[PDB]
Amino acid sequence: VPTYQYNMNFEKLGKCIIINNKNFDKVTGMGVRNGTDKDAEALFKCFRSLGFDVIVYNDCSCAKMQDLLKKASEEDHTNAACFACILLSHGEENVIYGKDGVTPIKDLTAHFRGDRCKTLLEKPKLFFIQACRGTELDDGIQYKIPVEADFLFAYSTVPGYYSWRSPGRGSWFVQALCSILEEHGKDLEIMQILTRVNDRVARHFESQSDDPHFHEKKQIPCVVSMLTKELYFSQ
């Protein structure tokens, strides 16, 4: 009263995992996510600027993704300030597509509970998810600590909705997120950043297909926070 920031005084800001799924198996019938490569390239340079050690894995299967995050939580994070994961794929509420079929997000993040990844205790664990969480469209108008503590989920959309994307400019959430980080990534606290992000995708974007049933639609991101302190990317 006051109270404040997460300790950022470490050799490393932290590791960042970017899973970019563009092509899926015929079995699933899901379409190619053209423009996601443009999203991933943008995310790559931004999180690098912040100070993350970015790594991009392409078209992963459910096992790959599961195993990929499992090992991450097994690495030693003592010299890291935080951890970040960016998921780029098709998805359905509570789920993200892999090249295979489908995987519950809960299991991806689960590996970081405070009792399953001790080098990350009392440290922020960030997950940015760019995926659908349903198919609806927004049509328009006018001491001891909780193993579940210190997580942050920045979903590109609200539960049950579709997540928009430009084949040329990339997905809406990503495009907007990278713009705010580029201008304030090292100036505002996470919630301020993710808030300005919500404002852009909400005001500065509006769909536009020839088919009428998807015209002039809108989208609003969903930020889910279990963070216990303010987070800045600049000691």
Binding site: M30, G31, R33, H90, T135, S166, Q208, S209, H213
Partner: peptide, 17 residues
């Protein structure tokens, strides 16, 4: 079954703008 759903469930719908 509606084609307008085919695209969405297969995530083919895009912003074309």
């Amino acid at each position: 079954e509606t084609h307008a759903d085919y695209l969405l469930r297969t995530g083919q719908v895009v912003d074309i703008s």
